[PDB]
Structure 1
Amino acid sequence: ITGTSTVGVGRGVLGDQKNINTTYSTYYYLQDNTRGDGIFTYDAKYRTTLPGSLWADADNQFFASYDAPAVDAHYYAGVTYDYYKNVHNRLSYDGNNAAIRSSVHYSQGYNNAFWNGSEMVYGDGDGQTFIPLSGGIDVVAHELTHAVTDYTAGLIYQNESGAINEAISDIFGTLVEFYANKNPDWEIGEDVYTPGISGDSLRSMSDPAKYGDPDHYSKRYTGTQDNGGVHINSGIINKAAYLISQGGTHYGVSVVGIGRDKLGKIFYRALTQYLTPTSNFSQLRAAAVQSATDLYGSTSQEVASVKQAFDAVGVK
């Protein structure tokens, strides 16, 4: 809508206060004009019709419980936008400042969130398995990273390609979480999963085995569930990324850590320059080695650590 750019204030799903960019035209709308072609957040009002209504609020204060998922989908879309722009010089998910649209209060008791090709969609969860999913910055960034992948490598969502696709979203979801700098970690969905249970999450990048996921290629899942194990086999690449950043000795293979920023550069370059729709794990290792080579030189520590990390997870 046309109107005045304004800054409201509210509380997200976890109860923290944050400022949000709005547009004033009789009501204050969740429309942030400061980022690319705009960030727009909509109320689906418990229906499944999309996108719903551009979110309108009378007074520019967003402290009601009903407001919290909207606050976070809007705010974390902005953080994700800032991450890709400031850290990778990428303007929105398509590199051309495409508007970011998100709908919250999608359906009822819906325990999921997804990028549908044109927008983000967030369930409220059922209150037991999940609370509203936009409350997890890593979830928001994980899903928007699928759009980045769709606009770059186009990794196919099945088997090893699909597990790379998932791991890319977990890696950049986590890097966004660290960029936001509030309560980062190397777990996925910890903020919104199982409100009754402290210290769990959907999966762990530092220790995939904590939740039954493989941490080595010899333990790869080869069944047909989950599109050939895309959220299961992602543990193998997630652990490799964790080793590259933080180091460790995994199955007796020592990896010298090079930090989060360099992990980010290496994988972003691999994703945008070298991966193709059918890249398998071995081809990912080759792309990451080539990317670290381009960035740091063939004799660098960074190249050696990428090699160690893939060796440690059994990806030749």
Structure 2
Amino acid sequence: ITGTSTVGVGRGVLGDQKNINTTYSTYYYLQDNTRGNGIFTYDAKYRTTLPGSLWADADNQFFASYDAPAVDAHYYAGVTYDYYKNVHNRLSYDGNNAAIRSSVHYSQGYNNAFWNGSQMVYGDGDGQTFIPLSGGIDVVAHELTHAVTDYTAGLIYQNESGAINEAISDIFGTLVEFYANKNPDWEIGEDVYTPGISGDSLRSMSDPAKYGDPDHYSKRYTGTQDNGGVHINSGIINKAAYLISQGGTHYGVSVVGIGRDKLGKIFYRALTQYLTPTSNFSQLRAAAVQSATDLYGSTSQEVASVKQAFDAVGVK
């Protein structure tokens, strides 16, 4: 909408207060004009018709329980935009400052979030499996990263390419969580998953097997559920990424860590310059090796560590 940029204040899903960029024109809308061509957050009103209505508020204060998922979807989309711009010199998901749209209060008791090809969509959860999923910065960044993937490598959402697609979203979701630097970890979704159970999460990158997912190619799933295991076999790539960053010895193979920043540079370059819609795990290894070679040199530690990490998870 046309209006003037304003600054509201509210509380997110976890009860934390934060400022949000809004737009005033009769109402205060969740429209952040400070980033690209805007970040826009919508109310889906417990229905499934998208996007719903641009979020309107009478007083620029967003402290109601109903407001909390919107506050966080809006704010964490901003953090994610900032990460891609400041760290990777990428302007929004398309690289040309496309408007970023999210809808919250999608459906009833909806235990998921997704990119629908055009926007992000967040359920509220059923209150037992999840609380509203936009409360997780890693989840928000995971979802927006699907848009980045779709505009770049275009990894098909099934089988190995789809597991790479998922892992890219978990990797950058985690790197955004570290960028914001509030309780960062290598787990996915811990802030919104199972409010009655402490210390768990949806997936672990450091130890995928803790939540049932493979950590070696010899344990990959090859059935048909979950689009051929895209959220399952992502554990193999997540583990490789974790080892590149943090190091470790895994199934007897030692990896010298190179840190999160270099992990992000290598995988961002692989995603945007080498991966294709049909890339498989072996092709991802080759893309990561080439990316690290471009950035750091063929004789570098970074190249050697990428190779060690993929060796450790059984990907040649």
* Superposition TM-score, scaled by structure 2 size: 0.99
Distance 1:4 1:152 in 2: 33
Q: Distance in 2 between matches of 1:112 and 1:219?
A: 26
For 2:224 and 2:52, locate their aligned partners in 1 and report how far apart those are by CA, in whole Å.
Answer: 35
Q: How far apart in 2 are the matches of 1:60 and 1:243?
A: 44
Q: Secondary structure at the match of 2:291?
A: helix
Q: Distance in 2 between matches of 1:233 and 1:120?
A: 23
Separation of aligned partners in 2, 1:131 and 1:238: 24
Moved over 6 A (4+): none
Secondary structure of the structure 2 residue equivalent to 1:226: helix
Aligned length, in residue pairs: 316
1:1-316 aligned within 5 A: 1-316=1-316
CA apart distance, 1:282: 0.6
In structure 1, stretches of 5+ residues that fail to align are none
**1:255-292 CA distances to partner (integer Å, 9 max, x unpaired)?**
00000000000000000000011111111000000000
Q: Give the Cα separation in 1 of the matches to 2:3 and 2:277.
A: 42
Supply the distance in 2 between the matched residues of 1:254 and 1:17 (Cα, whole angstroms).
43
Deviations 1:87-124 (A, max 9, x none): 00000000010000111111111111111111111111
Task: Quote the offset at 1:46 in angstroms.
Answer: 1.1
Structure 1 residue 57 displacement after superposition: 1.0
* Runs of 5+ unmatched residues, structure 2: none
What's the CA shift for 1:144?
0.8
Q: Deviation per CA, 1:7-36: give whole Å up to 9, x if none.
A: 111110011111100011121110000000
Give me the CA root mean square deviation.
0.7
| Superposed CA offset, 1:128-185 (max 9, x none) | 0110011111111111111111100111111111110100000000001111111110
1:122 and 1:35 map into 2 onto residues whose CA distance is 21
Distance 2:176 2:160 in 1: 24
Distance 1:292 1:18 in 2: 38
Give the superposition deviation at 1:212. Answer: 1.2
3-state SS in 1 of match to 2:14 = coil
In 2, Cα distance between the equivalents of 1:46 and 1:307? 47
Q: Which secondary structure does the structure 1 equivalent of 2:141 belong to?
A: helix
- Inter-partner Cα distance in structure 2 for 1:295 and 1:214: 30
Counterpart CA distance in 1 for 2:190 and 2:26 is 38
- CA–CA distance in 2 between the matches of 1:310 and 1:48? 41
Secondary structure of 2:28's aligned partner: strand
Distance 1:141 1:109 in 2: 22
- CA shift, 1:4, in A, is 1.3
- Distance in 1, Cα, partners of 2:190 & 2:59: 32
Residue 59 of structure 1 and its aligned partner are, at CA, apart by 1.2
Give, in whole Å, the separation in 2 of the partners of 1:104 and 1:221.
Answer: 32
The whole-number CA distance in structure 1 between the counterparts of 2:4 and 2:159 is: 48
Q: SS where residue 265 of structure 2 aligns? A: helix
1:47 is displaced (CA, Å) by 1.5
Write the deviation string for residues 234-274 of structure 1: whole angstroms up to 9, x where unpaired.
00000000000000011111100000000000000000000
Query: What is the distance in 1 between the residues matched to 2:45 and 2:128?
Result: 20
1:50 and 1:234 map into 2 onto residues whose CA distance is: 29
**1:58 Cα deviation (Å)?**
1.3
Question: Percent identity at matched positions?
Answer: 99
